[PDB]
Amino acid sequence: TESYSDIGGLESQIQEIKESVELPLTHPELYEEMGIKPPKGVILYGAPGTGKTLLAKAVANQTSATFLRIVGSELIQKYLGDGPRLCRQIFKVAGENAPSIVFIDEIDAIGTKRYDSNSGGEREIQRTMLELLNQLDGFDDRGDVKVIMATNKIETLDPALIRPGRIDRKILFENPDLSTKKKILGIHTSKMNLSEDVNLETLVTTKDDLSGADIQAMCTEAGLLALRERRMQVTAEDFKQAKERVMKNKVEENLEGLYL
Amino acid sequence: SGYDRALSIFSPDGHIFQVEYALEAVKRGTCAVGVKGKNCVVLGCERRSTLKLQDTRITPSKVSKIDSHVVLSFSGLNADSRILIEKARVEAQSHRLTLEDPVTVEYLTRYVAGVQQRYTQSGGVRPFGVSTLIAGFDPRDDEPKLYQTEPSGIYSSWSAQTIGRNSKTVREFLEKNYDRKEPPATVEECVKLTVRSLLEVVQTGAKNIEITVVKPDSDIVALSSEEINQYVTQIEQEKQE
Amino acid sequence: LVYNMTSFEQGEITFDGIGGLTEQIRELREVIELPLKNPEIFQRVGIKPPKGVLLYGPPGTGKTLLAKAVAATIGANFIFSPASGIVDKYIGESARIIREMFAYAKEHEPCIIFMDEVDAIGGRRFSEGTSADREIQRTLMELLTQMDGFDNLGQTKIIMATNRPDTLDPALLRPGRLDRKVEIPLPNEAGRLEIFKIHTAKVKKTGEFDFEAAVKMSDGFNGADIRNCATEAGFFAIRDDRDHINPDDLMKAVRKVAEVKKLE
Amino acid sequence: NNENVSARLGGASIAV
Amino acid sequence: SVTMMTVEEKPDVTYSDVGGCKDQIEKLREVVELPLLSPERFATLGIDPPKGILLYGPPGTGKTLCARAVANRTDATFIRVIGSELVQKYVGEGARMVRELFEMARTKKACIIFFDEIDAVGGARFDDGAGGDNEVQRTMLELITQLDGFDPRGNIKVMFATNRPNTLDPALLRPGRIDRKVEFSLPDLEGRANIFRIHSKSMSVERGIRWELISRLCPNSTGAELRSVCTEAGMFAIRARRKVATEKDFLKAVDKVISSRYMQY
Amino acid sequence: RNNYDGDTVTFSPTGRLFQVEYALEAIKQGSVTVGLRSNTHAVLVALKRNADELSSYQKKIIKCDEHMGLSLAGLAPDARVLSNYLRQQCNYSSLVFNRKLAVERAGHLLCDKAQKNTQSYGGRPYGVGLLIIGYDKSGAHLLEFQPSGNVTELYGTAIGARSQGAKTYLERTLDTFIKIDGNPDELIKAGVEAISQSLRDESLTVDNLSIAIVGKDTPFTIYDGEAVAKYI
Amino acid sequence: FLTRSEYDRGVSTFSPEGRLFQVEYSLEAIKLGSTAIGIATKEGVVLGVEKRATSPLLESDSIEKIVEIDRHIGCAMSGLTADARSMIEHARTAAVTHNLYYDEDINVESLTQSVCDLALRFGEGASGEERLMSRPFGVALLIAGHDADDGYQLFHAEPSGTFYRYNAKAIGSGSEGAQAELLNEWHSSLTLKEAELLVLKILKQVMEEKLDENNAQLSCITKQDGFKIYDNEKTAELIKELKEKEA
Amino acid sequence: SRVKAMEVDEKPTETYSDVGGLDKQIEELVEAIVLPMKRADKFKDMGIRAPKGALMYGPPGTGKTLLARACAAQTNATFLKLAAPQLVQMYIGEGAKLVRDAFALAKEKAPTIIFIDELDAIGTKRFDSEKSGDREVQRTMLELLNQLDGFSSDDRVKVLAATNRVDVLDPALLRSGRLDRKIEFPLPSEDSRAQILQIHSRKMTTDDDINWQELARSTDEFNGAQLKAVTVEAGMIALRNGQSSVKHEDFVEGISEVQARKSKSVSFYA
Ligand SMILES: Nc1ncnc2c1ncn2[C@@H]1O[C@H](COP(=O)(O)OP(=O)(O)OP(=O)(O)O)[C@@H](O)[C@H]1O
Ligand SMILES: Nc1ncnc2c1ncn2[C@@H]1O[C@H](COP(=O)(O)OP(=O)(O)OP(=O)(O)O)[C@@H](O)[C@H]1O
Ligand SMILES: Nc1ncnc2c1ncn2[C@@H]1O[C@H](COP(=O)(O)OP(=O)(O)OP(=O)(O)O)[C@@H](O)[C@H]1O
Ligand SMILES: Nc1ncnc2c1ncn2[C@@H]1O[C@H](COP(=O)(O)OP(=O)(O)O)[C@@H](O)[C@H]1O
DSSP: OOOSSSOOSOSTTHHHHIIIIITTTTOTHHHHHHTOOOOSOEEEOOOSSSOSHHHHHHHHHSOSSBOOOOOTTSSOOSSSSSHHHHHHHHHHHHHHTOSEEEOOOOGGGTOOOOOOOSSSSTHHHHTHHHHHHIIIIISSOOOSEEEEEEOSOOTTOOOSSSSTTTOOEEEOOOSOOHHHHHHHHHHHTTTSOOOSOOOHHHHSOTTOOOOSSHHHHHHHHHHHHHHTTTOOSOOSHHHHHHHHHHTTTSOOOTTOSOOO | OOTTSOSSOOOTTSOOSTTTTHHHHHTTSOOOOEEEOSSOEEEOOOOOOOOTTSOTTSOOOSOOOSBTTEEEEEEEOSHHHHHHHHHHHHHHHHHHHHHSSOOOHHHHHHHHHHHHTHHHHSSSOOOOOEEEEEEEEOTTSOOEEEEEEETTTEEEOBSEEOOSTTHHHHHHHHHHHOOTTSOOOSHHHHHHHHTTTTHHHHSSOTTSOOOEEEOSSSOEEOOOSHHHHTHHHHHHHSOOO | OOSOOOGGGTOOOOSSSSSOOSHHHHHHIIIIIHHHHOHHHHHHHOOOOOOOEEEOSOTTSOTTHHHHHHHHHHTOOBOOOOGGGTOOSSSSSSHHHHHHHHHHHHHSSSEEOOBOOGGGTSOOOOSOOHHHHHHHHHHHHHHHHHHSSSOOOSSEEOOEEOSSTTOOOSOOOOSSSOOEEEOOOOOOHHHHHHHHHHHTOSOOSSOOOOSTTHHHHTTOOSHHHHHHHHHHHHHHHTTTTOSSOOHHHHHHHHHHHTTHHHHO | OOOOOOTTOOOOOOOO | OHHHHOBOOOOOOOSTTOOSOSSHHHHHHHHTHHHHHOTHHHHHHOOOOOOSBEEEOOTTSSOHHHHHHHHHHHTSEEEEEOTTSSOOSSTTTTHHHHHHHHHHHHHSSSEEEEESOTTTTTTOOOSTTOOSOOHHHHHHHHHHHHHSSSOOOSSEEOBOOBSOGGGSOTTSSSTTTOOOEEEOOOOOHHHHHHHHHHHTSSSOBOSOOOHHHHHHHSOSOOSSHHHHHHHHHHHHHHHTTOSSBOSHHHHHHHHHHHOOOOTTO | OOOSOSSTTOOOSSSOOHHHHHHTTTGGGSOOEEEEOOSSEEEEEEOOOOSSSSSOOOOOEEEEETTEEEEEEEOSHHHHHHHHHHHHHTTTSSSSSOOOOOHHHHHHHHHHHHHHHHHSSSSOOOOEEEEEEEOOSSOOEEEEEOTTSOOOBOSOEEESTTOHHHHHHHHHHTTTTTTOOSOHHHHHHHHHHHHTTSOSSOOOOGGGOEEEEEETTEEEEEEOGGGGSTTO | OOOTTSSOSOTTOOOTTSOOSHHHHHHHHHTTSOOOEEEEOSSOEEEEBOOOOOOTTBOGGGSOSOOOOSSSEEOOOOBOHHHHHHHHHHHTTHHHHHHHHSSSOOOHHHHHHHHHHHHGGGSSOTTSOOOOOSSOOOBOBOOEEEETTTEEEOOEEOSSSOEEOOSEEEOSSOTTTHHHHGGGSOOTTOOSTTTHHHHHHHHHHSSSSOOOSSSOBOEEEETTTEEEEOOHHHHHHHHHHHHHHHO | OOTTTOOOOOSSOOOSSSOOOOHHHHHHHIIIIIHHHHOTTHIIIIIOOOOOEEEEEOOSSSSHHHHHHHHHHHHTOOOOBOOHHHHHSSOOSSHHHHHHHHHHHHHTTSSEEEEEOOTTTTOBOOOOSOSTTTHHHHHHHHHHHHTSSSSSOOOOEEEEEEESOSSSBOTTSSSTTTOOOEEEOOOOOHHHHHHHHHHTTTTSOBOSOOOHHHHHHTOSSOOHHHHHHHHHHHHHHHHHHTOSSBOHHHHHHHHHHHTTOOOOSOSSOO
16 A cells, blocks of 8 residues: 655665566557567565565555465465466466566465475475476466565575576665665654754664664654653654664674674 | 685685685774875774773774884784784894895785785685785885785785775775875875775764874874864864755 | 284194294293193282293294294284384384284284384484484383383283394393393204204105204204205205105205305 | 365475 | 367477577487488388487576477477376376376377476485375376386377486386486587577667677576576666667676676686 | 595495596596507507697607607696606616616506505595507517506507507407517508597598607607608 | 586595596686787787776786796786796796706796696695695696797696697687687788787777776787886887777 | 286297396296296195295396296296286275286186286385275285195296385285295396397497497496497487497497586596
């Protein structure tokens, strides 16, 4: 349901999905003018608390097309031979409902190496990882259905499907830099009072090794923390006690201080 | 893989690993900047203000001279830096002994790299988790120069360079400002050039810095804590808005 | 049937048509036959009848032919549980099998076990992979409690055959049960013709006798040797379509086939 | 003919 | 029934649009076309060609296109025995299809098939023979029972595929079962220089380009990382809004897909 | 997995050594070279491979002394070690005894070197096989060498990649060119039809060929270059 | 069919292919290194090198791929610039001391053999030596120079031992493209100024940036003047010479 | 119905000039299973428990599925060549009814032999998820085996079995009486490897100046399956180059193409 004008930060990251999805419905004559067809596939690295799912739900707000809802674990089934049928179902109907989009998330549940196990159940997902491959690039083209898959860790996972033919760009997210923490803070705080203390360009600062999601906890944890003082509007030191808290157990550099 | 747990084997791309992993250690260390004017050199540091229990009577010091016309600065880790500093100053005073003549700076710089080459080649040994640089003047001339060194064992001659945290911000910065079209002349602009260069990292703390410069005729001079504190302000004086 | 023969308590192989021993087999006569024969004394003393036995030694001794045979004299059900063929890689399911058989044995009224190669149970644990060796005792320890819990029966006897005794020292499981541990022999040179007299029977061969057989049987003292020599010495009188054995084929047989029975 | 087999419908299994 | 549905029906792709694999085809069409086109030259010596060849290689190396490139070329029935159509539940409903699969083929002549990604079923080497019931064990032993033991047929060509060969049985390296193990592997320069050109036919770039620079600049890479170049290279001009491509554009397109410097050289 | 082949300390599970047995496929990915004998004069020939259409060719024949030489096949830099070694013994048993070093004594101690690398942890086996010739106070000889140590005295053999396409010429024509003597002009012609049966369209350019010869009244000497278009 | 992945973690282990791998990998390091060229007329030898401008604030003469190793010899590094220094310190310790133990001038074919007698010191020593290195070090020199025996020639010295007398070498990031086309641009009957042209040309097709007096370097040998390299000024005037010629 | 669909392979057979080597293995067999079939009298009259059957175990590509075809037509003893799989398939009410019919017919047509395939699918030692899926299979073969002899039968039916794994099986078949003679097929030595090589090649056109010896030496870890295949591809090489025969070269490059080496072949060697 959300929109743009609700992120601010991700700009180097966001131009791609625009170039994959939001744009080609508009002005495909650009791509063909060169003699080129856009990607069939996208993926998003992890580094959590940085706005992955948020991005996907945004484009759903303005896409003028059919959009889907899957997490990696809805694919799997129990009867040992019906899982992989389900994958071919969703892709053919998308063609029937084309132009369409999908979104498979947390697919580290599915995507793992060919572990060569001995269980009897862990096999029936590997085949389920495989019809996808045989469906997605496989043998025959599929048309204009695009993938926006996500995860949280890939550095030893997602073996082979991560290649061109299936996915073409690999956006990655991290905890932001100092420059982005500026504008992102304006986002959440643009409904409160902010009585007179702002000083925000020292409130957020490097060595605040935090996320791009904890800030809204800090924003909201302060207001009630001021409310309980019977003061609805806000000052700075409301936020100071908060940042003292939420940062407390992120990291500790006790092994640092050696590289003098 | 397994190609990266030693110094005496090559990955199939051809490149060894344990060396450039050192370049990840040195990235975890403090800044160390250097610039040469027309007739004077400077050097910086990202000194820390850790806590109110280190003796102010003895501030620490990254910099460490070896002879009255050469200095040295580094970043990485200090223990493995303490050694080659002592193998350096030893080697220089020997060259005065045997030859009755001080050291050309290039000769020195190939001795410190002449050990960073063996301490990676022959196994049974770990490298020196440190990059360094040299600064000073040759005897009987004003020719300025600084050389860099790194644990692969190679020596270059930059005119400006840095090592460590957010160096990537700086080595692009001076490229945008410093240039051989207009080489600086004297101290107060080489320093006014440099003190602003640190600012990507210093986050406005002036208890977190030191500085030195260089003379001809085999001299040096250190610098105070108020003698920057004004230079904290002229650099901010331009930053009115 | 599903698992094992059970011998219908009467399939009467001859425990004496054999070149084995008299002392050991009479040592076993005590622990099994005497109570099942004569409970008037263990009752009179109140001691409960015995709990199993071990029969060490490597093969050739016939440490399984006597077992089902004397079981046939008394008439119990003879089965197997070769620990090599009981282990399963899964966490449980090595102990489940133990639990089936003590139950299923009791489904039958009498029943006796013949475990073999039980060193698979009693391992030294030199690897010390706690994901595994924590479980090796788990299935083993279940035996100790599944075997003597509430079972106050006089029918359910136990045997364990264990080549390589004392390889096990995680636990010797000494105290209490194993009321005997028979000092097993090997086939002495005197016992050779005691053995050759066994298999030679049921043959028309002009005798086929000799004293050059124990010298041939020297160091080939395993029952398979004699079973097989009589086999292949039987295949040499037919090598020329003859009518009856000559004893030279025996002097040829054991001399020329104990070779594999001494080198590998 | 309602001989509906159990389908051999899998299930996990701990290792070692 | 369903097996009748899975049939190629003419995708458009040549051997002109494949590059560095200029000899690895010379093994592949040596077994397929000639026994089906020119069997007399073998017959002049009179021997049994191999049947049941295979191909293995890294991912995105360019094997599936060949398997359909050979389809339009031969003008003969092409058959796709793809996954999710051999391991359905309700045993008997699974392995009957493979029996019915060949039966269509045993009936018809001049026939070749395709098994896409056999690593599912053949790759299921019995886990130390464990499992009191192994539904894939029974259906793998039938096709080797089709193909080994005694002759299935005399004129039918078969090709498998595998991103990962070490899975399946040691019985699928063996005549009747399998004859050849072709290996698609990474290109060299003179192959890449003929993979760029095909993906840049449509592209609206202007000359002044020397891909010899690029191949020296693109190390070990697949035949699919070399099309993605052509997308992003052509794309940067779009966000920069130009009606033509440069060469320098490729130089910052190449840097992404392959993906702080080795200053010691 | 054929284990037990990480180093030359371990045996097979049968009685075999694999690192050695893997060395012998090194000679098989080098070039070819061949050697004959007569009761007066012996000879050897070798095709030397280029590096491109422009480079030089590979120094393949080397004078260890005047009454004795060799011809390698396989890995060359490990041959230079042996070539320097003979050049010391021969330059030792003439500064001390003054005697012409018996050619057979050479192979009678190289085997006592390829062994002492086979044993211990470190180094490698001398991954090359090679041929030796020589005249002495006894008569002409040929002695070969394969890395495992075993040398052998022969009338004529060959080694390298695609060499058995020459050995059959020898086994077919052995009885002829052994009685021969006094006229090296045709013996030297013998190997050329012996080697030319064993080619991948090489066609034997003058530059692509090296010949060395010894004899009673003839020293060891190399014939390469334009002085070899004769012996095509 | 277990593969190469196992017998590739030790200098002293063959594989059933019959070969080593570490030495076979060393050749795949010079590939990472910048280019290098050498071609030889009858009038004189030339060289040519790219220098890989990393940033515009490096005194480009700080780093050297060219050495006045002696009166009549030169070299050309390509690969790890570090371990090259362990050669030339041994190389021009020979060309000197040969002027002592023989009081004359040297021949290259000792020199290129000497350095190639050194690179194999990680194992069996030629002169019955011992071991001094765990790591065959990846650079591929080009020993140009003059002797009065055969005249002007160059070489190619790997770390893997053997050498070759090329008449036109090219090694680095361009050996695949360049040495293909020198095979149709080599004449026995060249000038000198028929040589420095193409070596700038070929070095242009091969690499990234547009040329400049700073982003290249080259030199020439002649028996009387020696290892005379060229200033940035002189080299700049040939680059312009190419253009008006190219029209 | 499969028993009618199955038939003896007595009519087309290898004729036994096609096997190479294996001097003592078959001599063990004929001395153990064949001679008794023609001297049923003595092994009832001399008085001895005849060899009821025997087993052969060894790795693939080695002559298991083959050798059982030679001995039958050699001796004119009908049979069937059986398949553990087609028993084990989704049909369940026949695995027992079939094997009952198996010895039933083989009892007729006496004297006869019977033989089965790899026991990978019916070894079935496992007490895993459900035993009753298959225990009704073996137990009938056990009982059907017990039909063979025990009360002085001399039924003249004899049994053999092949399988790679001699360890996974039921350990109820090695028992006495039923069978005790497990045969190892060793992998071949060099003098044994070469006869395998000629014999898959006499149909092929060749020259006479081969020395087949070292070609065997180049092959270790190979036997018959690994052997004829290089005997194939040499001819496959002969056409692409255009020959009318196969040379020594074409064989040896076959070896190099078993595992696709494709060596650099000029890498600083000489
Ligand atoms: N720029 C931003 N503006 C507002 N909220 C943000 C921004 N970036 C991150 N967030 C916060 O981060 C949360 C989303 O985290 P993320 O996208 O990682 O969830 P996800 O896709 O499920 O991944 P994970 O499983 O790691 O949480 C949102 O609830 C949102 O509040
Ligand atoms: N020589 C080539 N020319 C053009 N495209 C190529 C070439 N080689 C590979 N490709 C590209 O690779 C893609 C197909 O990869 P391919 O399916 O062969 O890999 P794969 O290993 O079969 O993948 P999977 O194992 O998942 O089937 C195609 O989109 C094609 O563009
Ligand atoms: N002694 C031999 N003589 C001739 N050919 C042999 C011999 N041994 C093996 N072969 C070859 O090996 C193949 C036969 O192997 P066989 O079928 O007996 O094993 P298999 O039954 O395939 O093994 P598995 O049962 O594991 O599949 C044939 O190609 C045959 O030519
Ligand atoms: N004392 C004996 N007298 C005669 N035959 C014997 C004797 N001991 C063993 N045998 C022979 O050996 C076989 C028993 O083997 P055995 O040694 O019991 O194996 P295991 O030791 O594994 O139980 C019998 O079939 C029998 O023919």
